[PDB]
C-alpha cells in the first residue's frame, strides 16, 4: 500500500527495508536487492529467473515458436536506471490503487492475509511454512528468515506474461484450502496493452474503432485481486474452465476462460457463473475456515522464537474474522464469513476498479489485447496518482483522450 518512504534503487542496504534477499528456490540463486515498500510487501526490480528453475534465462524461443500475444527483450530491466524507474513506477501504481476506497480496502486485506502456520506434522503445534518467507542477508553474510505476503517482481522471458504465482506444498493445496501462501506477482509498469473501444454515441461507426491503452493501475489491481484470493486460500482451481456459451453447440468449438479469471474480472463476465456453483464454493471454503478455527483451538505449542502462540492465534483470528468466546475458543460466524468472502470475490474485481478509477477499460475479459506499448508512468506530466493518463485540467481529461494511443501518441510507443 502507501509507501511512506522515498526509495531510490541506489540507496544503501540497511538490512531492514532495503537489502539483498534469497527466496525459497531449487537452484542456489545469487541474492537480489529488494525493497520493503510497506508491511508484508516487497518489490524486487529484477527479471524473474529465480522463482522457477525451468525459467532460469531470458532467452527468447525461436521466432516462429513464440505466440502472437507475447514480447521478448532480454535487455529489459538490466540497468540500475531501469530498476530505479521500475521501482518508482510500481510504487506510484500502489499509491493510485491506495487512493481509491476500494484499493485501500484490498491492500488492507492483503496485508492482513498472512499465510496460515500449517507447516507442522504435529496437529497440536503451529509452525510457519518455509516457502512463505524470504531470507534477508545480514552484514556477516548470515541470513534472517522473514515472513511476507506479497512480492512484486519483474517478468520472466515473456515480458507481458503477468501472473500471480506461489510455492506449493507436498500435500496441502495452499491457494485453495483457506491457508494461503506468499504471492509473487510478475509485473511491469513499463508496458501496457492496447484494446479497441467505440465511444461513438451515434450510429455511424463507418470509420472503425478507437485505439486505447489499458491503465497499468488496473492491470496491477487485477493481479492483486488474484493475490487476495490466494492469500486467503480461496482461489478456484485453474482446471475449472469455461468455454463461452452465448452461442455454443457441443463439446467446445472456441477459446476458453477459467472461472478464476472470470471471477476476478467481474461485471457481466462473472454473472455467467451459476449462482448454484457459487454457493457450492462458498460453503466449501466456509468449512475450510472452520477447520482452521479447529486447528487453532487444538494448538498447544508453537515453533519459533519471537511470537507466542496467543500472538499468532490473534493474527489468524483477525485474518479470518473468527469469533472468540470467553473460553478463548474460536468459531466461524456464517455472517462474517459471507461478508469477507463476498468482499474478496465479488467486491474486489477488475470491473469495480475501473469504476473507481473512472478510466476506459476492456468491457469483457474476452476482449483480447491488440498490441503492446512502451510507456513511462514516472514523470508527473505523463501520469498521476489521481488521474492516471487522463490529466485533469487538460484535453487528456476529455473522452479518455489520455488513454487514446492516437491522440496521446507521445505516451505510447508501439513495439508489436
Ligand atoms: Zn488474471
mmCIF file of C-alpha atoms and ligand atoms in Angstrom:
data_model
loop_
_atom_site.group_PDB
_atom_site.id
_atom_site.type_symbol
_atom_site.label_atom_id
_atom_site.label_comp_id
_atom_site.label_asym_id
_atom_site.label_seq_id
_atom_site.Cartn_x
_atom_site.Cartn_y
_atom_site.Cartn_z
ATOM 1 C CA UNK A 1 0.000 0.000 0.000
ATOM 2 C CA UNK A 2 1.044 3.537 0.789
ATOM 3 C CA UNK A 3 4.818 3.874 0.621
ATOM 4 C CA UNK A 4 5.776 6.348 3.359
ATOM 5 C CA UNK A 5 9.426 6.415 2.351
ATOM 6 C CA UNK A 6 11.268 7.658 -0.720
ATOM 7 C CA UNK A 7 13.105 4.712 -2.265
ATOM 8 C CA UNK A 8 15.881 5.122 -4.825
ATOM 9 C CA UNK A 9 17.407 1.947 -6.259
ATOM 10 C CA UNK A 10 20.831 3.358 -5.356
ATOM 11 C CA UNK A 11 20.007 3.740 -1.647
ATOM 12 C CA UNK A 12 22.344 1.678 0.560
ATOM 13 C CA UNK A 13 21.166 -1.624 2.011
ATOM 14 C CA UNK A 14 20.136 -1.285 5.665
ATOM 15 C CA UNK A 15 19.054 -4.875 6.228
ATOM 16 C CA UNK A 16 15.591 -3.626 7.240
ATOM 17 C CA UNK A 17 13.576 -2.305 4.289
ATOM 18 C CA UNK A 18 16.467 -2.286 1.805
ATOM 19 C CA UNK A 19 18.566 -5.422 1.456
ATOM 20 C CA UNK A 20 19.719 -8.374 -0.611
ATOM 21 C CA UNK A 21 17.487 -11.414 -0.260
ATOM 22 C CA UNK A 22 17.056 -15.006 -1.402
ATOM 23 C CA UNK A 23 13.740 -16.775 -1.975
ATOM 24 C CA UNK A 24 12.972 -20.468 -1.337
ATOM 25 C CA UNK A 25 14.461 -21.945 -4.508
ATOM 26 C CA UNK A 26 15.666 -25.188 -6.074
ATOM 27 C CA UNK A 27 18.831 -23.678 -7.516
ATOM 28 C CA UNK A 28 21.360 -21.819 -5.365
ATOM 29 C CA UNK A 29 20.467 -18.330 -6.611
ATOM 30 C CA UNK A 30 22.577 -15.248 -6.001
ATOM 31 C CA UNK A 31 20.816 -12.665 -3.792
ATOM 32 C CA UNK A 32 18.963 -9.676 -5.246
ATOM 33 C CA UNK A 33 18.416 -6.162 -3.940
ATOM 34 C CA UNK A 34 14.808 -5.826 -2.744
ATOM 35 C CA UNK A 35 12.738 -3.073 -1.137
ATOM 36 C CA UNK A 36 10.057 -3.429 1.543
ATOM 37 C CA UNK A 37 7.647 -0.698 0.430
ATOM 38 C CA UNK A 38 5.049 -1.466 3.130
ATOM 39 C CA UNK A 39 4.430 -4.038 5.883
ATOM 40 C CA UNK A 40 4.465 -7.582 4.395
ATOM 41 C CA UNK A 41 5.109 -6.287 0.868
ATOM 42 C CA UNK A 42 8.399 -6.269 -1.047
ATOM 43 C CA UNK A 43 9.419 -5.223 -4.572
ATOM 44 C CA UNK A 44 12.293 -6.931 -6.446
ATOM 45 C CA UNK A 45 13.286 -4.860 -9.505
ATOM 46 C CA UNK A 46 14.768 -7.851 -11.359
ATOM 47 C CA UNK A 47 13.575 -10.040 -14.239
ATOM 48 C CA UNK A 48 12.219 -13.262 -12.679
ATOM 49 C CA UNK A 49 14.724 -16.056 -13.298
ATOM 50 C CA UNK A 50 14.527 -17.221 -9.652
ATOM 51 C CA UNK A 51 11.088 -18.473 -8.589
ATOM 52 C CA UNK A 52 11.013 -21.270 -11.172
ATOM 53 C CA UNK A 53 14.132 -23.290 -12.122
ATOM 54 C CA UNK A 54 12.757 -24.158 -15.571
ATOM 55 C CA UNK A 55 12.654 -20.408 -16.258
ATOM 56 C CA UNK A 56 16.253 -19.536 -15.424
ATOM 57 C CA UNK A 57 17.079 -17.466 -18.506
ATOM 58 C CA UNK A 58 15.667 -14.605 -20.579
ATOM 59 C CA UNK A 59 16.474 -16.261 -23.902
ATOM 60 C CA UNK A 60 13.507 -15.910 -26.290
ATOM 61 C CA UNK A 61 12.214 -19.041 -28.086
ATOM 62 C CA UNK A 62 12.509 -19.498 -31.872
ATOM 63 C CA UNK A 63 10.901 -16.588 -33.735
ATOM 64 C CA UNK A 64 8.361 -18.960 -35.300
ATOM 65 C CA UNK A 65 7.680 -20.605 -31.937
ATOM 66 C CA UNK A 66 6.599 -17.589 -29.883
ATOM 67 C CA UNK A 67 2.869 -16.866 -29.623
ATOM 68 C CA UNK A 68 1.308 -13.781 -31.275
ATOM 69 C CA UNK A 69 0.482 -12.381 -27.838
ATOM 70 C CA UNK A 70 3.971 -12.009 -26.371
ATOM 71 C CA UNK A 71 7.005 -9.718 -26.272
ATOM 72 C CA UNK A 72 10.661 -10.507 -25.693
ATOM 73 C CA UNK A 73 13.687 -8.353 -24.877
ATOM 74 C CA UNK A 74 16.350 -9.977 -22.710
ATOM 75 C CA UNK A 75 17.789 -6.493 -22.153
ATOM 76 C CA UNK A 76 14.770 -5.039 -20.344
ATOM 77 C CA UNK A 77 15.339 -4.306 -16.636
ATOM 78 C CA UNK A 78 19.086 -4.916 -16.765
ATOM 79 C CA UNK A 79 20.383 -1.474 -15.773
ATOM 80 C CA UNK A 80 20.230 0.453 -12.493
ATOM 81 C CA UNK A 81 18.299 3.338 -14.057
ATOM 82 C CA UNK A 82 15.673 0.917 -15.401
ATOM 83 C CA UNK A 83 15.397 -0.728 -11.992
ATOM 84 C CA UNK A 84 15.037 2.659 -10.323
ATOM 85 C CA UNK A 85 12.318 3.599 -12.794
ATOM 86 C CA UNK A 86 10.620 0.225 -12.293
ATOM 87 C CA UNK A 87 10.671 0.775 -8.525
ATOM 88 C CA UNK A 88 9.204 4.269 -8.886
ATOM 89 C CA UNK A 89 6.554 3.045 -11.307
ATOM 90 C CA UNK A 90 5.417 0.213 -9.050
ATOM 91 C CA UNK A 91 5.345 2.495 -6.019
ATOM 92 C CA UNK A 92 3.223 5.014 -7.927
ATOM 93 C CA UNK A 93 0.707 2.386 -9.054
ATOM 94 C CA UNK A 94 0.313 1.200 -5.462
ATOM 95 C CA UNK A 95 -0.451 4.792 -4.411
ATOM 96 C CA UNK A 96 -3.015 5.209 -7.218
ATOM 97 C CA UNK A 97 -4.710 1.976 -6.088
ATOM 98 C CA UNK A 98 -4.456 3.051 -2.432
ATOM 99 C CA UNK A 99 -6.019 6.455 -3.285
ATOM 100 C CA UNK A 100 -9.346 4.737 -4.037
ATOM 101 C CA UNK A 101 -11.548 3.473 -1.207
ATOM 102 C CA UNK A 102 -11.720 0.095 -2.971
ATOM 103 C CA UNK A 103 -7.952 -0.018 -3.405
ATOM 104 C CA UNK A 104 -7.225 0.859 0.216
ATOM 105 C CA UNK A 105 -9.514 -1.957 1.365
ATOM 106 C CA UNK A 106 -7.931 -4.531 -0.971
ATOM 107 C CA UNK A 107 -4.416 -3.596 0.138
ATOM 108 C CA UNK A 108 -5.550 -3.730 3.765
ATOM 109 C CA UNK A 109 -6.964 -7.247 3.148
ATOM 110 C CA UNK A 110 -3.676 -8.316 1.520
ATOM 111 C CA UNK A 111 -1.561 -7.087 4.443
ATOM 112 C CA UNK A 112 -3.882 -8.874 6.895
ATOM 113 C CA UNK A 113 -3.805 -12.086 4.855
ATOM 114 C CA UNK A 114 -0.772 -13.710 6.490
ATOM 115 C CA UNK A 115 -0.285 -17.285 5.180
ATOM 116 C CA UNK A 116 -1.502 -19.741 7.813
ATOM 117 C CA UNK A 117 1.010 -21.502 10.086
ATOM 118 C CA UNK A 118 0.198 -25.029 8.978
ATOM 119 C CA UNK A 119 3.653 -26.492 8.475
ATOM 120 C CA UNK A 120 3.888 -28.913 11.405
ATOM 121 C CA UNK A 121 3.492 -32.696 11.239
ATOM 122 C CA UNK A 122 2.018 -32.498 14.758
ATOM 123 C CA UNK A 123 -1.670 -31.494 14.829
ATOM 124 C CA UNK A 124 -1.286 -29.560 18.092
ATOM 125 C CA UNK A 125 1.712 -27.476 17.010
ATOM 126 C CA UNK A 126 1.711 -24.259 14.959
ATOM 127 C CA UNK A 127 4.651 -23.776 12.620
ATOM 128 C CA UNK A 128 5.386 -21.386 9.768
ATOM 129 C CA UNK A 129 5.659 -22.829 6.282
ATOM 130 C CA UNK A 130 9.171 -22.134 4.989
ATOM 131 C CA UNK A 131 8.081 -21.156 1.464
ATOM 132 C CA UNK A 132 6.024 -18.281 2.896
ATOM 133 C CA UNK A 133 9.268 -16.490 3.847
ATOM 134 C CA UNK A 134 12.358 -14.924 2.245
ATOM 135 C CA UNK A 135 15.886 -14.851 3.601
ATOM 136 C CA UNK A 136 17.310 -11.430 4.351
ATOM 137 C CA UNK A 137 21.103 -11.253 4.274
ATOM 138 C CA UNK A 138 22.894 -9.800 7.277
ATOM 139 C CA UNK A 139 26.254 -7.915 7.408
ATOM 140 C CA UNK A 140 28.078 -11.189 8.081
ATOM 141 C CA UNK A 141 26.567 -12.888 5.053
ATOM 142 C CA UNK A 142 24.259 -14.636 7.513
ATOM 143 C CA UNK A 143 20.546 -14.971 6.718
ATOM 144 C CA UNK A 144 17.436 -13.909 8.628
ATOM 145 C CA UNK A 145 14.093 -15.513 7.776
ATOM 146 C CA UNK A 146 11.214 -13.048 7.434
ATOM 147 C CA UNK A 147 7.535 -13.722 6.715
ATOM 148 C CA UNK A 148 5.915 -11.792 3.884
ATOM 149 C CA UNK A 149 2.641 -11.761 1.976
ATOM 150 C CA UNK A 150 3.487 -10.306 -1.400
ATOM 151 C CA UNK A 151 6.389 -9.770 -3.749
ATOM 152 C CA UNK A 152 6.196 -7.719 -6.928
ATOM 153 C CA UNK A 153 8.882 -8.896 -9.325
ATOM 154 C CA UNK A 154 9.920 -8.303 -12.922
ATOM 155 C CA UNK A 155 8.611 -10.571 -15.710
ATOM 156 C CA UNK A 156 10.492 -13.627 -16.967
ATOM 157 C CA UNK A 157 11.345 -14.238 -20.656
ATOM 158 C CA UNK A 158 7.942 -13.152 -21.973
ATOM 159 C CA UNK A 159 7.754 -9.556 -20.733
ATOM 160 C CA UNK A 160 3.960 -9.238 -20.964
ATOM 161 C CA UNK A 161 3.071 -12.523 -19.276
ATOM 162 C CA UNK A 162 1.944 -11.076 -15.933
ATOM 163 C CA UNK A 163 0.745 -13.534 -13.340
ATOM 164 C CA UNK A 164 0.378 -14.204 -9.652
ATOM 165 C CA UNK A 165 2.304 -17.330 -8.598
ATOM 166 C CA UNK A 166 3.385 -19.063 -5.384
ATOM 167 C CA UNK A 167 5.252 -22.071 -3.983
ATOM 168 C CA UNK A 168 3.328 -25.280 -3.472
ATOM 169 C CA UNK A 169 3.392 -27.959 -0.786
ATOM 170 C CA UNK A 170 3.894 -31.739 -0.757
ATOM 171 C CA UNK A 171 0.275 -32.422 0.238
ATOM 172 C CA UNK A 172 -1.503 -29.130 1.033
ATOM 173 C CA UNK A 173 -3.293 -27.088 -1.668
ATOM 174 C CA UNK A 174 -2.391 -23.742 -0.083
ATOM 175 C CA UNK A 175 -4.181 -21.447 -2.528
ATOM 176 C CA UNK A 176 -7.415 -23.392 -2.070
ATOM 177 C CA UNK A 177 -7.592 -24.808 1.469
ATOM 178 C CA UNK A 178 -8.009 -21.484 3.255
ATOM 179 C CA UNK A 179 -4.363 -21.373 4.388
ATOM 180 C CA UNK A 180 -2.893 -19.131 1.735
ATOM 181 C CA UNK A 181 0.718 -18.689 0.605
ATOM 182 C CA UNK A 182 3.115 -15.822 -0.147
ATOM 183 C CA UNK A 183 2.304 -14.430 -3.587
ATOM 184 C CA UNK A 184 4.769 -13.456 -6.312
ATOM 185 C CA UNK A 185 3.433 -11.146 -9.000
ATOM 186 C CA UNK A 186 5.401 -10.970 -12.247
ATOM 187 C CA UNK A 187 4.566 -7.468 -13.414
ATOM 188 C CA UNK A 188 5.898 -4.409 -15.203
ATOM 189 C CA UNK A 189 4.720 -0.768 -15.085
ATOM 190 C CA UNK A 190 6.841 -0.014 -18.159
ATOM 191 C CA UNK A 191 4.481 -1.554 -20.721
ATOM 192 C CA UNK A 192 0.750 -1.792 -21.264
ATOM 193 C CA UNK A 193 -1.668 -3.222 -23.842
ATOM 194 C CA UNK A 194 -3.989 -1.678 -26.382
ATOM 195 C CA UNK A 195 -7.650 -2.522 -26.928
ATOM 196 C CA UNK A 196 -10.452 -1.381 -29.230
ATOM 197 C CA UNK A 197 -13.413 0.620 -27.959
ATOM 198 C CA UNK A 198 -16.170 2.615 -29.646
ATOM 199 C CA UNK A 199 -17.286 5.674 -27.678
ATOM 200 C CA UNK A 200 -19.492 6.708 -30.599
ATOM 201 C CA UNK A 201 -22.870 7.726 -29.179
ATOM 202 C CA UNK A 202 -24.439 7.992 -32.633
ATOM 203 C CA UNK A 203 -24.952 5.084 -35.030
ATOM 204 C CA UNK A 204 -22.244 5.860 -37.587
ATOM 205 C CA UNK A 205 -19.159 3.695 -36.841
ATOM 206 C CA UNK A 206 -18.247 3.913 -40.534
ATOM 207 C CA UNK A 207 -14.669 4.858 -39.613
ATOM 208 C CA UNK A 208 -13.678 1.939 -37.399
ATOM 209 C CA UNK A 209 -12.946 1.590 -33.690
ATOM 210 C CA UNK A 210 -10.842 3.757 -31.401
ATOM 211 C CA UNK A 211 -7.439 2.521 -30.220
ATOM 212 C CA UNK A 212 -6.869 2.818 -26.464
ATOM 213 C CA UNK A 213 -4.352 1.618 -23.868
ATOM 214 C CA UNK A 214 -5.071 -0.166 -20.608
ATOM 215 C CA UNK A 215 -4.272 1.833 -17.476
ATOM 216 C CA UNK A 216 -1.417 -0.083 -15.720
ATOM 217 C CA UNK A 217 -3.081 0.564 -12.343
ATOM 218 C CA UNK A 218 -5.988 -1.600 -13.466
ATOM 219 C CA UNK A 219 -3.645 -4.377 -14.614
ATOM 220 C CA UNK A 220 -1.837 -4.403 -11.248
ATOM 221 C CA UNK A 221 -5.149 -4.263 -9.367
ATOM 222 C CA UNK A 222 -6.215 -7.342 -11.360
ATOM 223 C CA UNK A 223 -3.181 -9.326 -10.200
ATOM 224 C CA UNK A 224 -3.603 -8.045 -6.615
ATOM 225 C CA UNK A 225 -7.145 -9.425 -6.662
ATOM 226 C CA UNK A 226 -5.702 -12.852 -7.555
ATOM 227 C CA UNK A 227 -3.188 -12.424 -4.726
ATOM 228 C CA UNK A 228 -6.078 -11.733 -2.372
ATOM 229 C CA UNK A 229 -7.898 -14.934 -3.362
ATOM 230 C CA UNK A 230 -4.679 -16.927 -2.991
ATOM 231 C CA UNK A 231 -3.578 -15.333 0.313
ATOM 232 C CA UNK A 232 -6.929 -16.336 1.799
ATOM 233 C CA UNK A 233 -6.767 -19.807 0.251
ATOM 234 C CA UNK A 234 -9.956 -19.393 -1.789
ATOM 235 C CA UNK A 235 -8.620 -19.380 -5.351
ATOM 236 C CA UNK A 236 -10.610 -21.522 -7.790
ATOM 237 C CA UNK A 237 -8.735 -24.456 -9.332
ATOM 238 C CA UNK A 238 -7.283 -23.344 -12.706
ATOM 239 C CA UNK A 239 -8.610 -26.553 -14.317
ATOM 240 C CA UNK A 240 -12.167 -25.291 -13.815
ATOM 241 C CA UNK A 241 -12.594 -23.526 -17.140
ATOM 242 C CA UNK A 242 -15.397 -22.100 -19.224
ATOM 243 C CA UNK A 243 -15.970 -22.314 -22.968
ATOM 244 C CA UNK A 244 -18.090 -19.268 -23.762
ATOM 245 C CA UNK A 245 -21.698 -20.280 -24.366
ATOM 246 C CA UNK A 246 -23.531 -17.165 -25.530
ATOM 247 C CA UNK A 247 -23.648 -19.362 -28.627
ATOM 248 C CA UNK A 248 -22.398 -22.928 -28.133
ATOM 249 C CA UNK A 249 -23.270 -26.215 -29.849
ATOM 250 C CA UNK A 250 -21.496 -29.249 -28.371
ATOM 251 C CA UNK A 251 -18.167 -30.098 -26.719
ATOM 252 C CA UNK A 252 -16.429 -26.736 -27.224
ATOM 253 C CA UNK A 253 -15.533 -25.024 -30.513
ATOM 254 C CA UNK A 254 -13.701 -21.878 -29.420
ATOM 255 C CA UNK A 255 -11.324 -20.330 -26.880
ATOM 256 C CA UNK A 256 -11.724 -20.877 -23.136
ATOM 257 C CA UNK A 257 -11.579 -18.839 -19.913
ATOM 258 C CA UNK A 258 -11.021 -20.015 -16.343
ATOM 259 C CA UNK A 259 -13.530 -19.415 -13.558
ATOM 260 C CA UNK A 260 -10.777 -17.759 -11.534
ATOM 261 C CA UNK A 261 -10.203 -15.247 -14.338
ATOM 262 C CA UNK A 262 -13.904 -14.531 -14.905
ATOM 263 C CA UNK A 263 -14.479 -14.006 -11.180
ATOM 264 C CA UNK A 264 -11.510 -11.652 -10.961
ATOM 265 C CA UNK A 265 -12.691 -9.592 -13.930
ATOM 266 C CA UNK A 266 -16.206 -9.152 -12.551
ATOM 267 C CA UNK A 267 -19.029 -7.404 -14.390
ATOM 268 C CA UNK A 268 -21.224 -9.345 -16.830
ATOM 269 C CA UNK A 269 -18.433 -11.919 -17.134
ATOM 270 C CA UNK A 270 -18.792 -13.091 -13.533
ATOM 271 C CA UNK A 271 -22.585 -13.032 -13.807
ATOM 272 C CA UNK A 272 -22.220 -16.106 -16.019
ATOM 273 C CA UNK A 273 -21.093 -18.203 -13.062
ATOM 274 C CA UNK A 274 -24.061 -20.249 -11.846
ATOM 275 C CA UNK A 275 -25.384 -18.923 -8.530
ATOM 276 C CA UNK A 276 -25.555 -22.592 -7.544
ATOM 277 C CA UNK A 277 -21.891 -23.235 -8.311
ATOM 278 C CA UNK A 278 -21.140 -20.020 -6.431
ATOM 279 C CA UNK A 279 -22.814 -21.235 -3.242
ATOM 280 C CA UNK A 280 -21.061 -24.578 -3.647
ATOM 281 C CA UNK A 281 -17.698 -22.799 -3.396
ATOM 282 C CA UNK A 282 -18.812 -20.535 -0.556
ATOM 283 C CA UNK A 283 -19.936 -23.441 1.624
ATOM 284 C CA UNK A 284 -16.769 -25.363 0.753
ATOM 285 C CA UNK A 285 -14.465 -22.560 1.893
ATOM 286 C CA UNK A 286 -16.730 -21.854 4.858
ATOM 287 C CA UNK A 287 -15.842 -25.340 6.061
ATOM 288 C CA UNK A 288 -12.139 -24.858 5.334
ATOM 289 C CA UNK A 289 -12.253 -21.782 7.568
ATOM 290 C CA UNK A 290 -13.969 -23.881 10.233
ATOM 291 C CA UNK A 291 -11.191 -26.480 10.015
ATOM 292 C CA UNK A 292 -8.699 -23.662 10.594
ATOM 293 C CA UNK A 293 -10.548 -22.412 13.674
ATOM 294 C CA UNK A 294 -10.459 -26.021 14.901
ATOM 295 C CA UNK A 295 -6.715 -26.252 14.314
ATOM 296 C CA UNK A 296 -6.164 -23.048 16.296
ATOM 297 C CA UNK A 297 -8.405 -24.337 19.114
ATOM 298 C CA UNK A 298 -6.344 -27.549 19.352
ATOM 299 C CA UNK A 299 -2.962 -25.767 19.232
ATOM 300 C CA UNK A 300 -0.905 -26.305 22.396
ATOM 301 C CA UNK A 301 2.580 -25.333 21.206
ATOM 302 C CA UNK A 302 4.386 -23.183 18.641
ATOM 303 C CA UNK A 303 7.728 -23.271 16.785
ATOM 304 C CA UNK A 304 9.958 -20.214 16.546
ATOM 305 C CA UNK A 305 11.467 -17.718 18.981
ATOM 306 C CA UNK A 306 9.636 -14.381 18.553
ATOM 307 C CA UNK A 307 5.867 -14.927 18.506
ATOM 308 C CA UNK A 308 3.951 -16.639 21.285
ATOM 309 C CA UNK A 309 1.079 -18.983 20.499
ATOM 310 C CA UNK A 310 -1.505 -16.454 21.661
ATOM 311 C CA UNK A 311 0.077 -13.843 19.411
ATOM 312 C CA UNK A 312 -0.279 -15.985 16.286
ATOM 313 C CA UNK A 313 -3.756 -17.109 17.306
ATOM 314 C CA UNK A 314 -4.714 -13.431 17.396
ATOM 315 C CA UNK A 315 -3.139 -12.858 13.970
ATOM 316 C CA UNK A 316 -5.369 -15.507 12.444
ATOM 317 C CA UNK A 317 -8.460 -14.502 14.392
ATOM 318 C CA UNK A 318 -8.011 -11.131 12.679
ATOM 319 C CA UNK A 319 -7.263 -12.556 9.233
ATOM 320 C CA UNK A 320 -10.232 -14.915 9.047
ATOM 321 C CA UNK A 321 -12.538 -12.759 11.183
ATOM 322 C CA UNK A 322 -13.047 -15.518 13.733
ATOM 323 C CA UNK A 323 -15.301 -15.113 16.761
ATOM 324 C CA UNK A 324 -13.786 -15.768 20.201
ATOM 325 C CA UNK A 325 -15.832 -16.835 23.246
ATOM 326 C CA UNK A 326 -14.997 -16.256 26.919
ATOM 327 C CA UNK A 327 -13.212 -19.616 26.880
ATOM 328 C CA UNK A 328 -10.961 -18.227 24.154
ATOM 329 C CA UNK A 329 -12.207 -20.833 21.690
ATOM 330 C CA UNK A 330 -12.601 -19.785 18.044
ATOM 331 C CA UNK A 331 -15.569 -20.315 15.737
ATOM 332 C CA UNK A 332 -16.525 -19.134 12.255
ATOM 333 C CA UNK A 333 -19.625 -16.946 12.104
ATOM 334 C CA UNK A 334 -21.601 -17.568 8.886
ATOM 335 C CA UNK A 335 -22.473 -13.881 8.555
ATOM 336 C CA UNK A 336 -18.893 -12.640 8.957
ATOM 337 C CA UNK A 337 -17.588 -15.282 6.549
ATOM 338 C CA UNK A 338 -20.145 -14.439 3.877
ATOM 339 C CA UNK A 339 -19.139 -10.777 4.138
ATOM 340 C CA UNK A 340 -15.406 -11.466 3.853
ATOM 341 C CA UNK A 341 -15.957 -13.946 1.026
ATOM 342 C CA UNK A 342 -18.139 -11.500 -0.902
ATOM 343 C CA UNK A 343 -15.566 -8.755 -0.373
ATOM 344 C CA UNK A 344 -12.706 -10.877 -1.736
ATOM 345 C CA UNK A 345 -14.648 -12.410 -4.612
ATOM 346 C CA UNK A 346 -17.432 -10.011 -5.677
ATOM 347 C CA UNK A 347 -16.401 -6.566 -4.477
ATOM 348 C CA UNK A 348 -12.717 -6.731 -5.387
ATOM 349 C CA UNK A 349 -12.954 -7.133 -9.177
ATOM 350 C CA UNK A 350 -11.319 -5.522 -12.177
ATOM 351 C CA UNK A 351 -14.665 -4.133 -13.314
ATOM 352 C CA UNK A 352 -15.230 -2.410 -9.966
ATOM 353 C CA UNK A 353 -11.731 -0.908 -10.059
ATOM 354 C CA UNK A 354 -12.438 0.584 -13.487
ATOM 355 C CA UNK A 355 -15.430 2.292 -11.837
ATOM 356 C CA UNK A 356 -13.321 3.730 -9.025
ATOM 357 C CA UNK A 357 -10.595 4.955 -11.392
ATOM 358 C CA UNK A 358 -13.164 6.362 -13.845
ATOM 359 C CA UNK A 359 -10.998 5.092 -16.729
ATOM 360 C CA UNK A 360 -11.733 3.302 -20.003
ATOM 361 C CA UNK A 361 -11.053 -0.446 -19.984
ATOM 362 C CA UNK A 362 -11.939 -3.633 -21.857
ATOM 363 C CA UNK A 363 -15.639 -4.275 -21.257
ATOM 364 C CA UNK A 364 -15.011 -8.025 -21.117
ATOM 365 C CA UNK A 365 -12.075 -10.241 -20.170
ATOM 366 C CA UNK A 366 -12.824 -11.756 -23.569
ATOM 367 C CA UNK A 367 -11.694 -8.538 -25.262
ATOM 368 C CA UNK A 368 -8.253 -9.702 -26.380
ATOM 369 C CA UNK A 369 -5.483 -7.091 -26.462
ATOM 370 C CA UNK A 370 -4.326 -5.882 -29.879
ATOM 371 C CA UNK A 371 -0.840 -4.578 -29.133
ATOM 372 C CA UNK A 372 1.873 -3.885 -26.591
ATOM 373 C CA UNK A 373 3.096 -0.351 -25.893
ATOM 374 C CA UNK A 374 6.178 1.002 -24.162
ATOM 375 C CA UNK A 375 5.228 3.670 -21.597
ATOM 376 C CA UNK A 376 6.691 5.706 -18.740
ATOM 377 C CA UNK A 377 4.401 6.474 -15.818
ATOM 378 C CA UNK A 378 7.030 8.073 -13.565
ATOM 379 C CA UNK A 379 7.021 11.707 -14.833
ATOM 380 C CA UNK A 380 4.086 13.679 -13.404
ATOM 381 C CA UNK A 381 3.456 15.268 -16.805
ATOM 382 C CA UNK A 382 2.645 11.826 -18.217
ATOM 383 C CA UNK A 383 0.687 10.082 -15.469
ATOM 384 C CA UNK A 384 -0.521 10.902 -11.955
ATOM 385 C CA UNK A 385 -1.822 9.051 -8.912
ATOM 386 C CA UNK A 386 -5.309 10.582 -9.170
ATOM 387 C CA UNK A 387 -5.945 10.780 -12.913
ATOM 388 C CA UNK A 388 -3.535 8.326 -14.499
ATOM 389 C CA UNK A 389 -3.073 9.284 -18.165
ATOM 390 C CA UNK A 390 -6.241 11.417 -18.236
ATOM 391 C CA UNK A 391 -4.716 14.533 -16.653
ATOM 392 C CA UNK A 392 -7.349 16.889 -15.238
ATOM 393 C CA UNK A 393 -7.279 20.498 -16.463
ATOM 394 C CA UNK A 394 -6.046 19.252 -19.839
ATOM 395 C CA UNK A 395 -7.582 17.806 -23.005
ATOM 396 C CA UNK A 396 -6.456 14.348 -21.872
ATOM 397 C CA UNK A 397 -9.195 14.541 -19.243
ATOM 398 C CA UNK A 398 -11.801 14.562 -22.009
ATOM 399 C CA UNK A 399 -13.214 11.420 -23.630
ATOM 400 C CA UNK A 400 -10.402 9.333 -22.095
ATOM 401 C CA UNK A 401 -8.071 11.070 -24.555
ATOM 402 C CA UNK A 402 -5.181 10.276 -22.230
ATOM 403 C CA UNK A 403 -5.659 6.565 -22.954
ATOM 404 C CA UNK A 404 -6.132 7.150 -26.675
ATOM 405 C CA UNK A 405 -2.940 5.917 -28.339
ATOM 406 C CA UNK A 406 -3.700 8.104 -31.368
ATOM 407 C CA UNK A 407 -4.299 11.387 -29.544
ATOM 408 C CA UNK A 408 -1.809 10.893 -26.685
ATOM 409 C CA UNK A 409 0.632 9.113 -29.019
ATOM 410 C CA UNK A 410 3.617 10.633 -27.196
ATOM 411 C CA UNK A 411 2.919 8.395 -24.182
ATOM 412 C CA UNK A 412 2.565 5.077 -26.050
ATOM 413 C CA UNK A 413 5.305 3.598 -28.231
ATOM 414 C CA UNK A 414 4.137 0.560 -30.184
ATOM 415 C CA UNK A 415 6.512 -2.400 -30.023
ATOM 416 C CA UNK A 416 4.338 -5.104 -31.564
HETATM 417 ZN ZN1 LIG B 1 -5.970 -12.805 -14.206
#
